[PDB]
Every structure is written in structure tokens, then in C-alpha cells.
Design an enzyme around this catalytic site. Structure first.
Site: not given
Ligand SMILES: *C(=O)N1C[C@H](NOS(=O)(=O)O)CC[C@H]1C(N)=O
Ligand SMILES: [K+]
Ligand SMILES: [K+]
Ligand SMILES: [K+]
Ligand SMILES: [K+]
Ligand SMILES: [K+]
Ligand SMILES: [K+]
Ligand SMILES: [K+]
Ligand code: NA
Ligand code: NA
Ligand code: NA
Length: 263
Positions: A105, A212, A45, A141
Site C-alpha cells: 500500500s 483506510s 487505498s 495520493e
Molecule cells: C490507503 O488507503 N492508504 C495508504 C495506506 N494503506 O494501508 S492500508 O491499506 O493497510 O490501510 C495507509 C492508509 C491509506 C492512506 N490514508 O494513505
């Protein structure tokens, strides 16, 4: 050479079992501290900063762009979309999508930013336009978070991402009002208090974007306004050997603490 800070980061990494990447720029003197600074890591993200910034750049020549509505349909929902799901069968403006992507996010919001740029390659093209030859966005995504070791897709290096984040938030890659908007968005992040921020003194102000993914990938990119000195830019990326590894935001906090203690 290996500095005391780099040795401490290596010791942290050894205890973590994973692979840690760090890049600091201290804008007081433009000096840099790097640990695996030229190795690639999956952005997850944290790539949303580049996408939001690319839309901000488009908005420099379109006063109403950020107010333009984008339709949200049931099929647009992916794995994490707390803001967009409230707008299904309705619309969100590009500002609303940018704020949701950065501060909550929201992955559906990120997909709308990517689409506004013509696909993942439009995000990469913006990176190139602002001097980043390293960043690449290859997928939408949620598949951009697969984070497979050795896979170049959807990766950058700590060095490149720190330089880009500096130019976007403190430099002149964006127009002044757009830079200020990006900074406001980052400072209002909701997801960051366990990551870089957790390793820094309370008095220091942080704007950041976390990420993450699979392989226990745990990331944060931040602009920091410390007490009594010029701003810092800090990237901390972390990834682990097994697909189902747990997140390790504490490792990012520990890296930030080492960096702060080394100034
Ligand atoms: C980004 O990495 N994503 C979207 C969302 N991000 O939230 S975080 O930045 O607090 O981790 C969840 C994790 C991730 C995804 N795998 O979609
Ligand atoms: K919701
Ligand atoms: K949140
Ligand atoms: K572009
Ligand atoms: K550059
Ligand atoms: K907010
Ligand atoms: K803080
Ligand atoms: K494995
Ligand atoms: Na929420
Ligand atoms: Na949540
Ligand atoms: Na994970």
C-alpha cells in the site's frame, strides 16, 4: 426483502455507530448479497486495484512495459511510502510500483501508476472500459483519502466494486497472464490479516486490498477461494461520522464472518 444475513449486517452496523457497505458475489451460482450495496463510500487505498489493473491492460500491447523504469524523486514522497523511499534518486519499474502499491500500500507507487495512466481520470476511463459506470478517481495520493461524508470524489459502491473485482480477477477484463499476475499480487498482500480474512475459516485462501482514510474509513476488497466451493468476491466498506474516528478492521472481519455463516 431483508434476508437473515442482511438483518445481521444491520445489527453489526448499529453496534458499530458507523455506516457499513457489503457486496458478495458467489461465483458458484452468481448470486449476490448486498448491504447498502448502491450507496457510495470512499475507496481510499482499495482504488489501487483499479490503477494496477489499468496498467496491466496497457501491458497487454507492450511486452516490456512492466520493466519500464520510473524515476522516484524526493518530492514524490507523500504520507506512506515504505518501498518508494528506498528508491529516491533512483527508479522503480512499473511492475515494482504495482507490487508496492498493492502488497505494501505504497502511496508514492500509486501516484506513479496514476501518472502512467494520465491522471486520476485515466483510472476512471479504464473502469468505464471494463463496464464499471460507478467508480470515480478524482485526486492523487494522499488527498484521495479525505473520505468526507457526502463527497462524491474518489468513491464507488460495494456492488460496482465487487462486480469489477470479479471481472478483473476471475473473468476476462484482463488477458490471462495479466489476470494471473493481479491474482498473485493480491494473494501476496501483507496488510489484510485483520480485515476480511480475520472473519473467515483458516482453510480459505484470500487475496485482498485494504484501505483506510479519515472519518475512520476502513475498507477491504477480496477474492476468496473457500474450502470445497467456487470462489467468492467480497467488498466491505466502512466509514464513520467524525473526521478523527479510529479504524475498525474488526467490523470488516465481523461482516465477513456473517457472510461466511450465511452461505
Ligand atoms: C490507503 O488507503 N492508504 C495508504 C495506506 N494503506 O494501508 S492500508 O491499506 O493497510 O490501510 C495507509 C492508509 C491509506 C492512506 N490514508 O494513505
Ligand atoms: K523504507
Ligand atoms: K505492510
Ligand atoms: K485509461
Ligand atoms: K458491468
Ligand atoms: K511480496
Ligand atoms: K486466509
Ligand atoms: K463530522
Ligand atoms: Na514494509
Ligand atoms: Na507499516
Ligand atoms: Na483514519
Amino acid at each position: 426483502q431483508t434476508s437473515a444475513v442482511q438483518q445481521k449486517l444491520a445489527a453489526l452496523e448499529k453496534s458499530s455507530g458507523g455506516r457499513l457497505g457489503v457486496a458478495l458475489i458467489d461465483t458458484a451460482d452468481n448470486t449476490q448479497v448486498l448491504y447498502r450495496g448502491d450507496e457510495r463510500f470512499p475507496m481510499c487505498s482499495t482504488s489501487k486495484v483499479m490503477a494496477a489493473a489499468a496498467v496491466l491492460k496497457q501491458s497487454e500491447t507492450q511486452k516490456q512495459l512492466l520493466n519500464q523504469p520510473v524515476e522516484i524523486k524526493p518530492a514524490d514522497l507523500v504520507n506512506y511510502n515504505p518501498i518508494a523511499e528506498k528508491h529516491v534518486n533512483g527508479t522503480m519499474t512499473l511492475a515494482e510500483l504495482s507490487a508496492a502499491a498493492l502488497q505494501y500500500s505504497d502511496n508514492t507507487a500509486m501516484n506513479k501508476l496514476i501518472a502512467q495512466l494520465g491522471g486520476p481520470g485515466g483510472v476512471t476511463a479504464f473502469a468505464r472500459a471494463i463496464g464499471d459506470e460507478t467508480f470515480r478517481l478524482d485526486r492523487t495520493e494522499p488527498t484521495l483519502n479525505t473520505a468526507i461524508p457526502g463527497d462524491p470524489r474518489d468513491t464507488t459502491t460495494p456492488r460496482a466494486m465487487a462486480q469489477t473485482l470479479r471481472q478483473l480477477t476471475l473473468g476476462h477484463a484482463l488477458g490471462e497472464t495479466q489476470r494471473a499476475q493481479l491474482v498473485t499480487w493480491l494473494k501476496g498482500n501483507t496488510t489484510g490479516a485483520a480485515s476480511i480474512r480475520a472473519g473467515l475459516p483458516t482453510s480459505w485462501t484470500v487475496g485482498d486490498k485494504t484501505g483506510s482514510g479519515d472519518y475512520g474509513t476502513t475498507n477491504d476488497i477480496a477474492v476468496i477461494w473457500p474450502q470445497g466451493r467456487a470462489p467468492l468476491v467480497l467488498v466491505t466498506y466502512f466509514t464513520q461520522p467524525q473526521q478523527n474516528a479510529e479504524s475498525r478492521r474488526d467490523v470488516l472481519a465481523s461482516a465477513a464472518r456473517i457472510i461466511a455463516e450465511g452461505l
